[PDB]
Design an enzyme around this catalytic site. Structure first.
Site, PDB file in Angstrom:
ATOM      1  N   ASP A 196      -3.177  40.290  -4.957  1.00 25.42           N
ATOM      2  CA  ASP A 196      -1.933  39.576  -5.028  1.00 25.42           C
ATOM      3  C   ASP A 196      -2.098  38.175  -4.487  1.00 25.42           C
ATOM      4  OD1 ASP A 196      -1.843  39.706  -2.233  1.00 25.42           O
ATOM      5  OD2 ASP A 196      -0.447  41.413  -2.183  1.00 25.42           O
ATOM      6  N   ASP A 198      -0.755  35.825  -1.861  1.00 28.42           N
ATOM      7  CA  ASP A 198      -0.027  35.748  -0.608  1.00 28.42           C
ATOM      8  C   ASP A 198       0.418  34.301  -0.305  1.00 28.42           C
ATOM      9  OD1 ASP A 198      -0.008  38.609   0.464  1.00 28.42           O
ATOM     10  OD2 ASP A 198      -2.182  38.377   0.262  1.00 28.42           O
ATOM     11  N   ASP A 281       3.571  37.911  -2.717  1.00 29.78           N
ATOM     12  CA  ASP A 281       4.208  38.195  -1.448  1.00 29.78           C
ATOM     13  C   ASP A 281       4.818  36.864  -1.035  1.00 29.78           C
ATOM     14  OD1 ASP A 281       1.975  40.734  -0.352  1.00 29.78           O
ATOM     15  OD2 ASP A 281       4.152  40.868  -0.049  1.00 29.78           O
TER      16      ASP A 281
HETATM   17  N1  LIG Z   1       3.024  45.664   8.146  1.00 25.94           N
HETATM   18  C1  LIG Z   1       2.284  44.578   8.404  1.00 25.94           C
HETATM   19  N2  LIG Z   1       2.255  44.048   9.707  1.00 25.94           N
HETATM   20  C2  LIG Z   1       1.521  42.944   9.962  1.00 25.94           C
HETATM   21  N3  LIG Z   1       0.763  42.269   9.089  1.00 25.94           N
HETATM   22  C3  LIG Z   1       0.794  42.799   7.793  1.00 25.94           C
HETATM   23  C4  LIG Z   1       1.504  43.907   7.366  1.00 25.94           C
HETATM   24  N4  LIG Z   1       1.307  44.159   5.999  1.00 25.94           N
HETATM   25  C5  LIG Z   1       0.496  43.196   5.646  1.00 25.94           C
HETATM   26  N5  LIG Z   1       0.141  42.322   6.696  1.00 25.94           N
HETATM   27  C6  LIG Z   1      -0.744  41.115   6.727  1.00 25.94           C
HETATM   28  C7  LIG Z   1      -2.182  41.387   7.299  1.00 25.94           C
HETATM   29  C8  LIG Z   1      -3.151  41.316   6.096  1.00 25.94           C
HETATM   30  C9  LIG Z   1      -2.370  40.488   5.138  1.00 25.94           C
HETATM   31  C10 LIG Z   1      -2.633  41.377   3.985  1.00 25.94           C
HETATM   32  O1  LIG Z   1      -2.573  41.602   2.742  1.00 25.94           O
HETATM   33  P1  LIG Z   1      -3.164  41.974   1.465  1.00 25.94           P
HETATM   34  O2  LIG Z   1      -3.439  43.365   1.845  1.00 25.94           O
HETATM   35  O3  LIG Z   1      -2.076  41.759   0.527  1.00 25.94           O
HETATM   36  O4  LIG Z   1      -4.271  40.923   1.641  1.00 25.94           O
HETATM   37  P2  LIG Z   1      -5.678  40.688   0.825  1.00 25.94           P
HETATM   38  O5  LIG Z   1      -5.181  39.337   0.589  1.00 25.94           O
HETATM   39  O6  LIG Z   1      -6.646  40.853   1.851  1.00 25.94           O
HETATM   40  O7  LIG Z   1      -5.839  41.702  -0.407  1.00 25.94           O
HETATM   41  P3  LIG Z   1      -5.507  41.112  -1.908  1.00 25.94           P
HETATM   42  O8  LIG Z   1      -6.594  40.284  -2.494  1.00 25.94           O
HETATM   43  O9  LIG Z   1      -5.270  42.301  -2.743  1.00 25.94           O
HETATM   44  O10 LIG Z   1      -4.241  40.388  -1.652  1.00 25.94           O
HETATM   45  O11 LIG Z   1      -0.939  40.628   5.357  1.00 25.94           O
HETATM   46 CO   LIG Z   2      -3.033  39.289  -1.054  1.00 23.88          CO
HETATM   47 CO   LIG Z   3      -0.215  41.003   0.219  1.00 23.92          CO
END
Ligand SMILES: Nc1ncnc2c1ncn2[C@H]1CC[C@@H](COP(=O)(O)OP(=O)(O)OP(=O)(O)O)O1
Ligand SMILES: [Co+2]
Ligand SMILES: [Co+2]
Ligand code: NA
Length: 357
Positions: A196, A198, A281
């Protein structure tokens, strides 16, 4: 050199020289994570993580001398690599029906472990024989992660991410020309592709009112055009920096799925459905807390963990997604940049693309 056992003092670049082990470890690790066993999953990630650090592939079982987070259990796992080529354990799990299915269901946006377990036990083994089953109803978050399953499972590259960045800006800006959107998460670490997109949204001049309204109006705005495919605006709940099982308090964030008309993308490449459902996100944080939002929402998952894990255990401090705390001098230490925060935790800065554990 004598490295550290805290990822926060590790320089984990995307240049991995042990993808072999690392992968096989991530499988067993993703395994213990799904087979509801929060224990070993810790010595796995932590091990697989360290390796991602090394600047050279591991050859003989001799090289693993010194390196931490490596217990007698995991070595026998590396063992099966050096003298074989693949991990019998890992190679086993991948063909383990409990796994396969679980990692097959949770793979759906909206599918949790509690939901992906009631199904496995019901006897289902494919999601082709699930949506079809005219019995069990689906949560919106699931119908969603289902209706767009295809495009979603199809990951995203930078050119896609960028198409979203403007997308976000041209929007959020229409509610605060002061707004500051930083592309965060994996992509900011240097992944050329992620699950995703972010984002972190903030702004100096903004009341504690304008904040709790933007994540909606912007939502409504795309809704007004068709770009919005799904939404779940979790109202900012967070505000003593927690340290245990807390996702109970957070900034105002929102999970979405936009419709990215391919016309609006910039890739050196030349299909039906001119668009593509894409996961995004969004987080908003009062300006006085951007410094931690960024660090906190920048990862890596394992990096973050070890960071504050160090914070506590080694500096007697508490690192929140929102604010750090010095339990000794009982004061809220703060900063205007990540750079400063490490300096606070007493750490040699780790560039964002170096937090790829
Ligand atoms: N409940 C939570 N409390 C604190 N931090 C959180 C929470 N949920 C997510 N995060 C933070 C920490 C890691 C970051 C994570 O997201 P994601 O898992 O979407 O990242 P990524 O970017 O490593 O994987 P992708 O490439 O799929 O996005 O968002
Ligand atoms: Co992400
Ligand atoms: Co995310
Ligand atoms: Na999911």
């Amino acid at each position: 050199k004598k490295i550290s056992q805290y990822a926060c003092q590790r320089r984990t670049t995307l240049n991995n020289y042990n993808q072999l082990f690392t992968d096989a470890l991530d499988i067993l690790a993703e395994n213990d994570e799904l087979r509801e066993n929060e224990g070993s999953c810790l010595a796995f990630m932590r091990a697989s993580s360290v390796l991602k650090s090394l600047p050279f592939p591991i050859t003989s079982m001799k090289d693993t001398e010194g390196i931490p987070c490596l217990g007698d259990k995991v070595k026998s796992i590396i063992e099966g690599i050096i003298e074989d080529g693949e991990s019998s354990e890992a190679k086993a799990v991948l063909n383990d029906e409990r796994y396969k299915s679980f990692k097959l269901f949770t793979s759906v946006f909206g599918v949790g472990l509690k939901t992906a377990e009631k199904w496995f036990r019901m006897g289902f083994r494919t999601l082709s024989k699930i949506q079809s089953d005219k019995s069990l109803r689906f949560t919106q978050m699931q119908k969603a992660g289902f209706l767009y399953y295809e495009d979603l499972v199809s990951c995203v590259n930078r050119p896609e991410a960028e198409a979203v960045s403007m997308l976000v800006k041209e929007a959020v800006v229409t509610f605060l020309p002061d707004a500051l959107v930083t592309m965060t998460g994996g992509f900011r670490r240097g992944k050329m592709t992620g699950h995703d997109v972010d984002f972190l949204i903030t702004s100096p001049e903004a009341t504690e009112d304008e904040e709790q309204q933007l994540l909606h109006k912007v939502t409504d705005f795309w809704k007004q055009q068709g770009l919005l495919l799904y939404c779940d605006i979790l109202e900012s709940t967070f505000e003593q920096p927690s340290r245990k099982v807390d996702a109970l308090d957070h900034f105002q964030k929102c999970f979405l799925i936009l419709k990215l008309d391919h016309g609006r993308v910039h890739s050196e490449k030349s299909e039906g459905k001119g668009w593509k459902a894409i996961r995004v996100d969004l987080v908003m944080c009062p300006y006085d807390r951007r410094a931690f939002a960024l660090l906190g929402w920048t990862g890596s998952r394992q990096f973050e963990r070890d960071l504050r894990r160090y914070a506590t255990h080694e500096r007697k401090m508490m690192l929140d997604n929102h604010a750090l705390y010095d339990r000794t001098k009982r004061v809220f230490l703060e900063a205007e940049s990540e750079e400063e925060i490490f300096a606070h935790l007493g750490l040699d800065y780790i560039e964002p693309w170096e937090r790829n554990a």
